[PDB]
Amino acid sequence: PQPRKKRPEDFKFGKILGEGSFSTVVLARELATSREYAIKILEKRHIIKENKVPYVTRERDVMSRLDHPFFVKLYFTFQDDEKLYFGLSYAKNGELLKYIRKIGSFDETCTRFYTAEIVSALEYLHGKGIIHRDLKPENILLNEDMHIQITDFGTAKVLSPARANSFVGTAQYVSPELLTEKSACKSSDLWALGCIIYQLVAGLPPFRAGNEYLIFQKIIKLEYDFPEKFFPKARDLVEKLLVLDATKRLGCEEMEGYGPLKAHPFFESVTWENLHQQTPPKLT
């Protein structure tokens, strides 16, 4: 028997944190507690006529199932005549993208630390049979303490008894199978992990071009290069993620799961069991 449904009147709304095609995220201070939430506001008419009800519903369903420190948390939901509100954990330090851009690229220690966190999140997600489908630095957020907080679950897939076909994520993190077989699997997220590691180190994602078509041509041909600089062990790890055959990516079920992934030499000095309680290294 939970507390009363909240209302917009219970909040003092502040700045917009971001805008999407279908939603807006706004900082709000709850008045009875003074707690700050990031409140995701979706308009019901726009959702209905853009046929997005399955996606908003999946978002709500999935977030309600997650209970882990590396995920943006859904505390509550309510609605008025026009709008839906998701009360979300407020991730103070913003997008991981912001930091890559600000410091250029990551040293080996910060790459290791954040890649390890991303790996733990995904192990947890995949253990629950959930594929993210649009993993990337824009939706890997950072809390006040600088730990990751992954978000944006409207576009997720929930497996049942490795299938999909409808949606295609952000061009650069899109996996080949989405472009050749339009089907998604947990492994699709591991491809996106390989891109993100490459990006943490190189400062830019591996497949880049002047438009989306050319990025897709590069992806299906596995057309990318490593900078000479690149941490050797991070290079070796990324080569075992950016594999065209999805049943052959490190961490996938056919490759015997997360153990071989977390054993990779690149993660040699990581203690996996308490990552969220370690003090993150400084950028930079």
Ligand X SMILES: CC(C)n1cc(C(=O)c2cncc(NCCc3cccnc3)n2)c2c(N)ncnc21
Please work out the total of residues on this chain that contact ligand X, with binding judged by CB under 6 A: 21
Question: Rounded to whole angstroms, how far apart are CA atoms 189 and 169?
Answer: 11
Of 41 and 244, nearer to ligand X (C-beta) is 41
Please identify which residue in 152, 173, 174, 185 interacts with ligand X, judged by CB under 6 A: 152
Question: Rounded to whole angstroms, how far apart are CA atoms 87 and 85?
Answer: 6
Of 86 and 216, nearer to ligand X (C-beta) is 86
CB neighbour list of residue 234: distance below 8 Å, 6 or more residues apart: 108, 111, 115, 197, 201, 266
- Secondary element (H or E) of residue 166: none
Q: Report helix, strand or coil for 282.
A: coil
Does position 177 interact with ligand X (CB under 6 A)? The reply is no
Binding mask 6-35 for ligand X (x = CB under 6 A): -----------xxxx--xxx----------
Does position 40 interact with ligand X (CB under 6 A)? The reply is yes
Structural tokens at position 185: 């699997």
Does position 192 interact with ligand X (CB under 6 A)? The reply is no
Does position 50 interact with ligand X (CB under 6 A)? The reply is no
Does position 172 interact with ligand X (CB under 6 A)? The reply is no
Binding mask 76-115 for ligand X (x = CB under 6 A): ------------xxxx--xx--------------------
Q: Which amino acid is at 163?
A: R
Does position 151 interact with ligand X (CB under 6 A)? The reply is yes
Binding mask 218-257 for ligand X (x = CB under 6 A): ----------------------------------------
138 annotated ligand binder: yes
80 is catalytic: no
Which residue in the block uniquely carries the two structure tokens 């726009």?
A: 46
Please identify which residue in 72, 131, 156, 261 interacts with ligand X, judged by CB under 6 A: 72
Question: Rounded to whole angstroms, how far apart are CA atoms 231 and 268?
Answer: 14
Q: Which of 67, 107, 134, 145 is catalytic?
A: 134
Give the CB-nearest residue to ligand X. Answer: 18
Question: Rounded to whole angstroms, how far apart are CA atoms 204 and 173?
Answer: 12
Long-range contacts of 261-269 (CB under 8 A, 24+ apart): 261/119, 262/119, 262/123, 264/233, 264/236, 264/237, 264/240, 265/233, 265/236, 265/237, 266/112, 266/115, 266/231, 266/233, 266/234, 266/236, 266/237, 267/112, 267/115, 267/116, 267/119, 268/233, 269/112
Which residue ranges make up the site for ligand X (CB under 6 A)? 17-20, 23-25, 38, 40, 72, 88-91, 94-95, 138-139, 141, 151-152
Annotated binding site: 21-23, 40, 89-91, 95, 138, 152
**Which residues are catalytic, by number?**
134
